[PDB]
PDB file of C-alpha atoms in Angstrom:
ATOM      1  CA  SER A1284      47.175 -78.885 -10.675  1.00  0.00           C
ATOM      2  CA  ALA A1285      44.112 -81.210 -11.953  1.00  0.00           C
ATOM      3  CA  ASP A1286      43.528 -83.250  -8.603  1.00  0.00           C
ATOM      4  CA  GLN A1287      43.146 -79.984  -6.489  1.00  0.00           C
ATOM      5  CA  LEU A1288      40.904 -78.965  -9.100  1.00  0.00           C
ATOM      6  CA  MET A1289      38.706 -81.698  -9.008  1.00  0.00           C
ATOM      7  CA  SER A1290      38.825 -81.662  -5.266  1.00  0.00           C
ATOM      8  CA  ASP A1291      37.330 -78.011  -5.311  1.00  0.00           C
ATOM      9  CA  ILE A1292      34.734 -78.475  -8.067  1.00  0.00           C
ATOM     10  CA  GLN A1293      33.430 -81.732  -6.701  1.00  0.00           C
ATOM     11  CA  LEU A1294      33.089 -80.028  -3.159  1.00  0.00           C
ATOM     12  CA  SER A1295      31.388 -76.966  -4.926  1.00  0.00           C
ATOM     13  CA  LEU A1296      29.021 -79.366  -7.057  1.00  0.00           C
ATOM     14  CA  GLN A1297      28.424 -81.501  -4.156  1.00  0.00           C
ATOM     15  CA  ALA A1298      27.097 -78.590  -1.887  1.00  0.00           C
ATOM     16  CA  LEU A1299      25.241 -77.195  -4.911  1.00  0.00           C
ATOM     17  CA  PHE A1300      23.398 -80.511  -5.244  1.00  0.00           C
ATOM     18  CA  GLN A1301      22.628 -81.143  -1.729  1.00  0.00           C
ATOM     19  CA  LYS A1302      21.072 -77.685  -1.553  1.00  0.00           C
ATOM     20  CA  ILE A1303      19.426 -77.631  -5.202  1.00  0.00           C
ATOM     21  CA  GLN A1304      18.117 -81.088  -5.094  1.00  0.00           C
ATOM     22  CA  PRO A1305      15.772 -81.083  -2.292  1.00  0.00           C
ATOM     23  CA  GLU A1306      14.232 -77.776  -3.616  1.00  0.00           C
ATOM     24  CA  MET A1307      13.768 -79.436  -6.662  1.00  0.00           C
ATOM     25  CA  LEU A1308      12.427 -82.693  -5.256  1.00  0.00           C
ATOM     26  CA  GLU A1309      10.001 -80.799  -2.932  1.00  0.00           C
ATOM     27  CA  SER A1310       8.500 -78.415  -5.804  1.00  0.00           C
ATOM     28  CA  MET A1311       7.982 -81.710  -8.067  1.00  0.00           C
ATOM     29  CA  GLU A1312       6.333 -83.528  -5.114  1.00  0.00           C
ATOM     30  CA  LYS A1313       3.743 -80.441  -4.833  1.00  0.00           C
ATOM     31  CA  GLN A1314       2.784 -80.608  -8.775  1.00  0.00           C
ATOM     32  CA  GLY A1315       2.118 -84.353  -8.036  1.00  0.00           C
ATOM     33  CA  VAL A1316       4.712 -85.545 -10.286  1.00  0.00           C
ATOM     34  CA  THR A1317       7.928 -87.814 -10.059  1.00  0.00           C
ATOM     35  CA  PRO A1318      11.095 -87.401 -12.043  1.00  0.00           C
ATOM     36  CA  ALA A1319      10.185 -90.285 -14.168  1.00  0.00           C
ATOM     37  CA  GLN A1320       7.101 -88.750 -14.845  1.00  0.00           C
ATOM     38  CA  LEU A1321       8.743 -85.609 -15.859  1.00  0.00           C
ATOM     39  CA  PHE A1322      10.995 -87.266 -18.135  1.00  0.00           C
ATOM     40  CA  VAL A1323       8.239 -88.816 -20.028  1.00  0.00           C
ATOM     41  CA  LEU A1324       6.430 -85.359 -20.107  1.00  0.00           C
ATOM     42  CA  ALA A1325       9.375 -83.625 -21.203  1.00  0.00           C
ATOM     43  CA  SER A1326      10.106 -86.509 -24.192  1.00  0.00           C
ATOM     44  CA  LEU A1327       6.448 -85.845 -25.224  1.00  0.00           C
ATOM     45  CA  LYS A1328       6.737 -82.063 -25.223  1.00  0.00           C
ATOM     46  CA  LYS A1329       9.999 -82.522 -27.422  1.00  0.00           C
ATOM     47  CA  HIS A1330       9.026 -85.151 -29.534  1.00  0.00           C
ATOM     48  CA  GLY A1331       4.850 -84.964 -29.904  1.00  0.00           C
ATOM     49  CA  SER A1332       4.318 -88.370 -29.897  1.00  0.00           C
ATOM     50  CA  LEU A1333       6.300 -91.495 -28.880  1.00  0.00           C
ATOM     51  CA  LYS A1334       5.955 -95.319 -28.867  1.00  0.00           C
ATOM     52  CA  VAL A1335       5.939 -96.816 -25.537  1.00  0.00           C
ATOM     53  CA  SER A1336       8.843 -98.726 -26.674  1.00  0.00           C
ATOM     54  CA  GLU A1337      10.715 -95.907 -27.547  1.00  0.00           C
ATOM     55  CA  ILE A1338      10.290 -94.189 -24.185  1.00  0.00           C
ATOM     56  CA  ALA A1339      11.310 -97.676 -22.362  1.00  0.00           C
ATOM     57  CA  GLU A1340      14.337 -97.493 -24.726  1.00  0.00           C
ATOM     58  CA  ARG A1341      15.385 -94.008 -23.790  1.00  0.00           C
ATOM     59  CA  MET A1342      14.959 -94.805 -20.106  1.00  0.00           C
ATOM     60  CA  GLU A1343      16.563 -98.155 -20.122  1.00  0.00           C
ATOM     61  CA  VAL A1344      13.438 -99.860 -18.247  1.00  0.00           C
ATOM     62  CA  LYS A1345      11.001-102.435 -19.508  1.00  0.00           C
ATOM     63  CA  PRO A1346       7.796-101.541 -21.200  1.00  0.00           C
ATOM     64  CA  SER A1347       5.997-102.775 -18.548  1.00  0.00           C
ATOM     65  CA  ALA A1348       7.796 -99.921 -16.362  1.00  0.00           C
ATOM     66  CA  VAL A1349       6.517 -97.012 -18.765  1.00  0.00           C
ATOM     67  CA  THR A1350       3.097 -98.446 -18.911  1.00  0.00           C
ATOM     68  CA  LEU A1351       2.768 -98.118 -14.974  1.00  0.00           C
ATOM     69  CA  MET A1352       4.013 -94.379 -15.738  1.00  0.00           C
ATOM     70  CA  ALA A1353       1.517 -94.061 -18.539  1.00  0.00           C
ATOM     71  CA  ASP A1354      -1.262 -95.590 -16.040  1.00  0.00           C
ATOM     72  CA  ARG A1355      -0.290 -92.899 -13.271  1.00  0.00           C
ATOM     73  CA  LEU A1356      -0.017 -89.997 -15.944  1.00  0.00           C
ATOM     74  CA  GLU A1357      -3.332 -90.645 -17.843  1.00  0.00           C
ATOM     75  CA  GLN A1358      -5.553 -91.272 -14.451  1.00  0.00           C
ATOM     76  CA  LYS A1359      -4.352 -87.592 -13.967  1.00  0.00           C
ATOM     77  CA  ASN A1360      -5.522 -86.959 -17.477  1.00  0.00           C
ATOM     78  CA  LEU A1361      -1.847 -85.613 -18.358  1.00  0.00           C
ATOM     79  CA  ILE A1362      -1.201 -88.001 -21.396  1.00  0.00           C
ATOM     80  CA  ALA A1363      -3.290 -90.005 -23.590  1.00  0.00           C
ATOM     81  CA  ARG A1364      -2.836 -93.039 -25.187  1.00  0.00           C
ATOM     82  CA  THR A1365      -3.629 -94.054 -28.954  1.00  0.00           C
ATOM     83  CA  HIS A1366      -2.918 -96.859 -31.262  1.00  0.00           C
ATOM     84  CA  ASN A1367       0.039 -96.533 -33.776  1.00  0.00           C
ATOM     85  CA  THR A1368      -1.124 -95.710 -37.096  1.00  0.00           C
ATOM     86  CA  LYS A1369       1.493 -98.319 -38.672  1.00  0.00           C
ATOM     87  CA  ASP A1370       0.562-101.022 -36.245  1.00  0.00           C
ATOM     88  CA  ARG A1371      -2.619-100.839 -34.394  1.00  0.00           C
ATOM     89  CA  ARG A1372      -1.228-103.082 -31.617  1.00  0.00           C
ATOM     90  CA  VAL A1373       1.633-100.759 -30.448  1.00  0.00           C
ATOM     91  CA  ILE A1374       0.694 -97.584 -28.365  1.00  0.00           C
ATOM     92  CA  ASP A1375       1.837 -93.940 -28.922  1.00  0.00           C
ATOM     93  CA  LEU A1376       1.653 -91.370 -26.137  1.00  0.00           C
ATOM     94  CA  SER A1377       1.092 -87.841 -26.318  1.00  0.00           C
ATOM     95  CA  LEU A1378       0.731 -84.921 -23.871  1.00  0.00           C
ATOM     96  CA  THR A1379      -3.150 -83.630 -23.126  1.00  0.00           C
ATOM     97  CA  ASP A1380      -3.615 -80.007 -23.131  1.00  0.00           C
ATOM     98  CA  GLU A1381      -3.676 -80.282 -19.161  1.00  0.00           C
ATOM     99  CA  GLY A1382      -0.292 -82.237 -19.165  1.00  0.00           C
ATOM    100  CA  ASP A1383       1.506 -79.374 -21.439  1.00  0.00           C
ATOM    101  CA  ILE A1384       0.481 -77.003 -18.866  1.00  0.00           C
ATOM    102  CA  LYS A1385       1.559 -79.310 -15.892  1.00  0.00           C
ATOM    103  CA  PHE A1386       4.990 -79.774 -17.397  1.00  0.00           C
ATOM    104  CA  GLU A1387       5.121 -75.824 -18.033  1.00  0.00           C
ATOM    105  CA  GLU A1388       4.414 -75.497 -14.421  1.00  0.00           C
ATOM    106  CA  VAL A1389       6.800 -77.701 -13.156  1.00  0.00           C
ATOM    107  CA  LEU A1390       9.829 -76.668 -15.451  1.00  0.00           C
ATOM    108  CA  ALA A1391       9.084 -72.751 -14.390  1.00  0.00           C
ATOM    109  CA  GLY A1392       9.416 -74.135 -10.891  1.00  0.00           C
ATOM    110  CA  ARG A1393      12.791 -75.486 -11.579  1.00  0.00           C
ATOM    111  CA  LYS A1394      13.698 -72.459 -13.485  1.00  0.00           C
ATOM    112  CA  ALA A1395      13.072 -70.185 -10.714  1.00  0.00           C
ATOM    113  CA  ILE A1396      15.082 -72.403  -8.315  1.00  0.00           C
ATOM    114  CA  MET A1397      17.938 -72.608 -10.489  1.00  0.00           C
ATOM    115  CA  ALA A1398      17.641 -68.724 -11.340  1.00  0.00           C
ATOM    116  CA  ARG A1399      17.968 -68.106  -8.049  1.00  0.00           C
ATOM    117  CA  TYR A1400      21.655 -69.133  -8.098  1.00  0.00           C
ATOM    118  CA  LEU A1401      22.453 -68.077 -11.555  1.00  0.00           C
ATOM    119  CA  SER A1402      21.691 -64.568 -10.426  1.00  0.00           C
ATOM    120  CA  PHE A1403      24.569 -64.436  -8.454  1.00  0.00           C
ATOM    121  CA  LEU A1404      26.830 -64.834 -11.778  1.00  0.00           C
ATOM    122  CA  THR A1405      27.779 -61.661 -13.687  1.00  0.00           C
ATOM    123  CA  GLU A1406      27.148 -60.904 -17.332  1.00  0.00           C
ATOM    124  CA  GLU A1407      30.301 -62.608 -18.235  1.00  0.00           C
ATOM    125  CA  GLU A1408      30.067 -65.561 -15.970  1.00  0.00           C
ATOM    126  CA  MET A1409      26.613 -66.087 -17.134  1.00  0.00           C
ATOM    127  CA  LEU A1410      27.904 -66.286 -20.912  1.00  0.00           C
ATOM    128  CA  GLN A1411      30.626 -68.730 -19.738  1.00  0.00           C
ATOM    129  CA  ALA A1412      28.097 -70.830 -17.904  1.00  0.00           C
ATOM    130  CA  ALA A1413      25.679 -70.884 -20.951  1.00  0.00           C
ATOM    131  CA  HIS A1414      28.665 -72.105 -23.166  1.00  0.00           C
ATOM    132  CA  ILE A1415      30.325 -74.656 -20.529  1.00  0.00           C
ATOM    133  CA  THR A1416      26.897 -76.339 -19.869  1.00  0.00           C
ATOM    134  CA  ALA A1417      25.832 -76.514 -23.441  1.00  0.00           C
ATOM    135  CA  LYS A1418      29.130 -77.924 -24.614  1.00  0.00           C
ATOM    136  CA  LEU A1419      29.146 -80.457 -21.482  1.00  0.00           C
ATOM    137  CA  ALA A1420      25.576 -81.616 -22.555  1.00  0.00           C
ATOM    138  CA  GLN A1421      26.304 -81.889 -26.300  1.00  0.00           C
ATOM    139  CA  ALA A1422      29.573 -84.185 -25.683  1.00  0.00           C
ATOM    140  CA  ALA A1423      27.625 -86.153 -23.178  1.00  0.00           C
ATOM    141  CA  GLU A1424      24.489 -86.782 -25.490  1.00  0.00           C
ATOM    142  CA  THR A1425      27.295 -88.345 -27.982  1.00  0.00           C
ATOM    143  CA  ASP A1426      28.094 -91.698 -26.757  1.00  0.00           C
TER     144      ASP A1426
ATOM    145  CA  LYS B  37      19.927 -64.074 -25.777  1.00  0.00           C
ATOM    146  CA  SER B  38      18.476 -62.400 -22.770  1.00  0.00           C
ATOM    147  CA  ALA B  39      19.289 -63.047 -19.114  1.00  0.00           C
ATOM    148  CA  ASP B  40      16.410 -64.979 -18.448  1.00  0.00           C
ATOM    149  CA  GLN B  41      16.746 -67.383 -21.410  1.00  0.00           C
ATOM    150  CA  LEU B  42      20.500 -67.622 -20.933  1.00  0.00           C
ATOM    151  CA  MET B  43      19.093 -69.245 -17.500  1.00  0.00           C
ATOM    152  CA  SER B  44      16.851 -71.055 -19.179  1.00  0.00           C
ATOM    153  CA  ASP B  45      19.393 -72.591 -21.738  1.00  0.00           C
ATOM    154  CA  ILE B  46      21.574 -73.492 -18.382  1.00  0.00           C
ATOM    155  CA  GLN B  47      19.025 -75.037 -16.825  1.00  0.00           C
ATOM    156  CA  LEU B  48      18.221 -77.512 -19.593  1.00  0.00           C
ATOM    157  CA  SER B  49      21.806 -78.184 -20.263  1.00  0.00           C
ATOM    158  CA  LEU B  50      22.158 -78.941 -16.639  1.00  0.00           C
ATOM    159  CA  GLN B  51      18.911 -81.036 -16.444  1.00  0.00           C
ATOM    160  CA  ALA B  52      20.362 -83.305 -19.261  1.00  0.00           C
ATOM    161  CA  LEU B  53      23.922 -83.572 -17.604  1.00  0.00           C
ATOM    162  CA  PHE B  54      22.246 -84.605 -14.582  1.00  0.00           C
ATOM    163  CA  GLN B  55      19.935 -87.369 -15.894  1.00  0.00           C
ATOM    164  CA  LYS B  56      22.969 -89.108 -17.400  1.00  0.00           C
ATOM    165  CA  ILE B  57      25.066 -88.318 -14.341  1.00  0.00           C
ATOM    166  CA  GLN B  58      23.029 -89.504 -11.875  1.00  0.00           C
ATOM    167  CA  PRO B  59      22.389 -92.988 -13.268  1.00  0.00           C
ATOM    168  CA  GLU B  60      25.954 -93.630 -13.839  1.00  0.00           C
ATOM    169  CA  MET B  61      27.100 -92.869 -10.459  1.00  0.00           C
ATOM    170  CA  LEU B  62      24.792 -95.029  -8.767  1.00  0.00           C
ATOM    171  CA  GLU B  63      25.432 -97.752 -11.348  1.00  0.00           C
ATOM    172  CA  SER B  64      29.023 -97.393 -10.286  1.00  0.00           C
ATOM    173  CA  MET B  65      28.122 -97.630  -6.749  1.00  0.00           C
ATOM    174  CA  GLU B  66      25.526-100.836  -7.154  1.00  0.00           C
ATOM    175  CA  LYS B  67      28.337-102.643  -9.056  1.00  0.00           C
ATOM    176  CA  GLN B  68      30.348-101.925  -5.987  1.00  0.00           C
ATOM    177  CA  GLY B  69      27.919-103.448  -3.782  1.00  0.00           C
ATOM    178  CA  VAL B  70      27.367-100.573  -1.635  1.00  0.00           C
ATOM    179  CA  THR B  71      24.356 -97.891  -1.469  1.00  0.00           C
ATOM    180  CA  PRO B  72      24.704 -94.501  -0.754  1.00  0.00           C
ATOM    181  CA  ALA B  73      23.628 -94.778   3.061  1.00  0.00           C
ATOM    182  CA  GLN B  74      26.158 -97.389   3.305  1.00  0.00           C
ATOM    183  CA  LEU B  75      28.763 -95.282   1.492  1.00  0.00           C
ATOM    184  CA  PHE B  76      28.208 -92.582   4.413  1.00  0.00           C
ATOM    185  CA  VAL B  77      28.753 -94.969   7.090  1.00  0.00           C
ATOM    186  CA  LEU B  78      32.237 -96.356   5.710  1.00  0.00           C
ATOM    187  CA  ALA B  79      33.218 -92.297   4.852  1.00  0.00           C
ATOM    188  CA  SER B  80      32.506 -91.520   8.421  1.00  0.00           C
ATOM    189  CA  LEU B  81      34.830 -94.561   9.908  1.00  0.00           C
ATOM    190  CA  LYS B  82      37.579 -93.337   7.444  1.00  0.00           C
ATOM    191  CA  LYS B  83      37.467 -90.192   8.521  1.00  0.00           C
ATOM    192  CA  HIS B  84      37.343 -90.491  12.145  1.00  0.00           C
ATOM    193  CA  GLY B  85      38.498 -94.184  12.918  1.00  0.00           C
ATOM    194  CA  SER B  86      35.992 -95.635  15.105  1.00  0.00           C
ATOM    195  CA  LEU B  87      32.491 -94.501  16.017  1.00  0.00           C
ATOM    196  CA  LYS B  88      29.249 -95.671  17.922  1.00  0.00           C
ATOM    197  CA  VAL B  89      25.940 -96.216  16.038  1.00  0.00           C
ATOM    198  CA  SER B  90      24.541 -92.988  17.763  1.00  0.00           C
ATOM    199  CA  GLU B  91      27.498 -90.961  16.597  1.00  0.00           C
ATOM    200  CA  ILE B  92      27.325 -92.082  12.960  1.00  0.00           C
ATOM    201  CA  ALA B  93      23.509 -91.678  13.014  1.00  0.00           C
ATOM    202  CA  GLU B  94      24.168 -88.017  14.479  1.00  0.00           C
ATOM    203  CA  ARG B  95      26.104 -86.933  11.700  1.00  0.00           C
ATOM    204  CA  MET B  96      23.770 -88.599   8.893  1.00  0.00           C
ATOM    205  CA  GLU B  97      20.780 -87.188  10.365  1.00  0.00           C
ATOM    206  CA  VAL B  98      18.741 -90.573  10.533  1.00  0.00           C
ATOM    207  CA  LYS B  99      17.707 -92.645  13.533  1.00  0.00           C
ATOM    208  CA  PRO B 100      20.147 -94.997  15.157  1.00  0.00           C
ATOM    209  CA  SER B 101      17.827 -98.149  14.277  1.00  0.00           C
ATOM    210  CA  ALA B 102      18.500 -97.317  10.645  1.00  0.00           C
ATOM    211  CA  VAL B 103      22.231 -97.032  11.300  1.00  0.00           C
ATOM    212  CA  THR B 104      22.209-100.481  13.207  1.00  0.00           C
ATOM    213  CA  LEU B 105      20.415-102.321  10.055  1.00  0.00           C
ATOM    214  CA  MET B 106      23.414-100.703   7.840  1.00  0.00           C
ATOM    215  CA  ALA B 107      26.135-101.934  10.218  1.00  0.00           C
ATOM    216  CA  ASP B 108      24.892-105.431  10.359  1.00  0.00           C
ATOM    217  CA  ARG B 109      25.097-105.653   6.455  1.00  0.00           C
ATOM    218  CA  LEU B 110      28.341-103.798   6.232  1.00  0.00           C
ATOM    219  CA  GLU B 111      29.651-106.519   9.008  1.00  0.00           C
ATOM    220  CA  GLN B 112      27.890-109.371   6.989  1.00  0.00           C
ATOM    221  CA  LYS B 113      29.927-108.017   3.696  1.00  0.00           C
ATOM    222  CA  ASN B 114      33.002-107.897   6.109  1.00  0.00           C
ATOM    223  CA  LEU B 115      33.655-104.109   5.467  1.00  0.00           C
ATOM    224  CA  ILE B 116      33.161-102.950   8.922  1.00  0.00           C
ATOM    225  CA  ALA B 117      33.823-104.613  12.391  1.00  0.00           C
ATOM    226  CA  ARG B 118      31.701-104.113  15.555  1.00  0.00           C
ATOM    227  CA  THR B 119      33.429-104.366  18.563  1.00  0.00           C
ATOM    228  CA  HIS B 120      32.429-103.930  22.241  1.00  0.00           C
ATOM    229  CA  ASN B 121      32.915-100.205  23.699  1.00  0.00           C
ATOM    230  CA  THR B 122      35.434 -99.704  26.462  1.00  0.00           C
ATOM    231  CA  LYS B 123      33.319 -97.370  28.889  1.00  0.00           C
ATOM    232  CA  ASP B 124      30.378 -99.682  28.492  1.00  0.00           C
ATOM    233  CA  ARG B 125      30.978-103.356  26.734  1.00  0.00           C
ATOM    234  CA  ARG B 126      27.235-103.580  25.891  1.00  0.00           C
ATOM    235  CA  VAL B 127      27.652-100.573  23.476  1.00  0.00           C
ATOM    236  CA  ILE B 128      29.012-101.117  19.915  1.00  0.00           C
ATOM    237  CA  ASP B 129      31.671 -99.628  18.214  1.00  0.00           C
ATOM    238  CA  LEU B 130      32.231 -99.495  14.368  1.00  0.00           C
ATOM    239  CA  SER B 131      35.075 -99.438  12.475  1.00  0.00           C
ATOM    240  CA  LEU B 132      36.760-100.057   9.068  1.00  0.00           C
ATOM    241  CA  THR B 133      38.207-103.270   8.132  1.00  0.00           C
ATOM    242  CA  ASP B 134      40.946-103.101   5.152  1.00  0.00           C
ATOM    243  CA  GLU B 135      38.069-104.671   2.791  1.00  0.00           C
ATOM    244  CA  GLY B 136      36.035-101.461   3.950  1.00  0.00           C
ATOM    245  CA  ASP B 137      39.033 -99.191   3.566  1.00  0.00           C
ATOM    246  CA  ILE B 138      39.364-100.474   0.230  1.00  0.00           C
ATOM    247  CA  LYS B 139      35.852-100.749  -0.971  1.00  0.00           C
ATOM    248  CA  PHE B 140      35.378 -97.096  -0.022  1.00  0.00           C
ATOM    249  CA  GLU B 141      38.325 -95.702  -1.856  1.00  0.00           C
ATOM    250  CA  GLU B 142      37.368 -97.864  -5.087  1.00  0.00           C
ATOM    251  CA  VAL B 143      33.926 -96.091  -4.746  1.00  0.00           C
ATOM    252  CA  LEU B 144      35.696 -92.629  -4.458  1.00  0.00           C
ATOM    253  CA  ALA B 145      37.580 -93.440  -7.472  1.00  0.00           C
ATOM    254  CA  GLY B 146      34.767 -94.540  -9.543  1.00  0.00           C
ATOM    255  CA  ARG B 147      33.067 -91.091  -8.832  1.00  0.00           C
ATOM    256  CA  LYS B 148      36.173 -89.221  -9.918  1.00  0.00           C
ATOM    257  CA  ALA B 149      36.526 -90.882 -13.123  1.00  0.00           C
ATOM    258  CA  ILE B 150      33.121 -90.292 -14.487  1.00  0.00           C
ATOM    259  CA  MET B 151      33.556 -86.760 -13.399  1.00  0.00           C
ATOM    260  CA  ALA B 152      37.187 -86.452 -14.965  1.00  0.00           C
ATOM    261  CA  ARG B 153      35.476 -87.798 -18.217  1.00  0.00           C
ATOM    262  CA  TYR B 154      32.610 -85.132 -18.400  1.00  0.00           C
ATOM    263  CA  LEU B 155      35.408 -82.576 -17.516  1.00  0.00           C
ATOM    264  CA  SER B 156      38.182 -83.882 -20.316  1.00  0.00           C
ATOM    265  CA  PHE B 157      35.649 -82.462 -22.908  1.00  0.00           C
ATOM    266  CA  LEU B 158      36.464 -78.889 -21.625  1.00  0.00           C
ATOM    267  CA  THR B 159      39.692 -76.956 -22.357  1.00  0.00           C
ATOM    268  CA  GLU B 160      42.000 -75.857 -19.078  1.00  0.00           C
ATOM    269  CA  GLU B 161      40.440 -72.180 -19.789  1.00  0.00           C
ATOM    270  CA  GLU B 162      37.003 -73.662 -19.367  1.00  0.00           C
ATOM    271  CA  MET B 163      37.879 -75.979 -16.475  1.00  0.00           C
ATOM    272  CA  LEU B 164      39.216 -72.860 -14.646  1.00  0.00           C
ATOM    273  CA  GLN B 165      36.016 -70.926 -15.308  1.00  0.00           C
ATOM    274  CA  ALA B 166      33.971 -73.981 -14.473  1.00  0.00           C
ATOM    275  CA  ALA B 167      35.693 -74.230 -11.020  1.00  0.00           C
ATOM    276  CA  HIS B 168      35.472 -70.195 -10.387  1.00  0.00           C
ATOM    277  CA  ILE B 169      31.823 -70.384 -11.067  1.00  0.00           C
ATOM    278  CA  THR B 170      30.710 -73.447  -9.347  1.00  0.00           C
ATOM    279  CA  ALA B 171      32.872 -72.159  -6.045  1.00  0.00           C
ATOM    280  CA  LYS B 172      30.905 -68.709  -6.274  1.00  0.00           C
ATOM    281  CA  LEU B 173      27.179 -70.485  -6.729  1.00  0.00           C
ATOM    282  CA  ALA B 174      28.485 -72.759  -3.849  1.00  0.00           C
ATOM    283  CA  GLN B 175      29.308 -69.903  -1.330  1.00  0.00           C
ATOM    284  CA  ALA B 176      26.341 -67.409  -2.357  1.00  0.00           C
ATOM    285  CA  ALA B 177      23.571 -69.827  -1.353  1.00  0.00           C
TER     286      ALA B 177
END
């Protein structure tokens, strides 16, 4: 009965979120980074280098919004700006050593929080959860 | 894959899912003309009929002064009514208008459709596994 099943899940997800979101936010605030800054750091760990216009695009915000995130990060010495080799006028971002370390400290913090919940799963359920979340995340990236 | 790597892949899938689902739910609400704080006012009135500002404030764990601003704007939108309390007429009761009731159901339907879509990617078997897993994670901690 799909509708009861959706109500069960919604209630489950809503309780997990209210419980996990504050913990994530509090851990971030202590490491000094916001969700948007974390998003930039993660995009740069994955892609190595990105144009300011590329990050703006993925985040669906104005180039100027990213430039302010970049200012905050550069001031904390977590990223560097360089001129693009194809067009000197366009700005590339990349991680510094210190930014790589900061992205890793934040992520490990997030992992440790999640794993307190996930550790109540049996091995069968862990494997199921790996597969379902990966499949949902794949289908969602394709839009 | 080890147990700690699995928990690592799960985290990264959840993170990618959440960063798509959060903005979509927000967007759906912004389009409806209702903030998350306002929705909670509408939800409480739907569930209980009429409440004083203080009672709503207590349920939301925010200051009465905040709920008073929320009520003023909701009244302006014609989503709630403000009336005199029977016991003390200087105290205000809040209740839904039919427009507010409709708005509230529209917001709930918008959220349910966003989640029916993410889950339509799963088989029924997987749906049932996801329900059991989420239910147990919720009851554990």
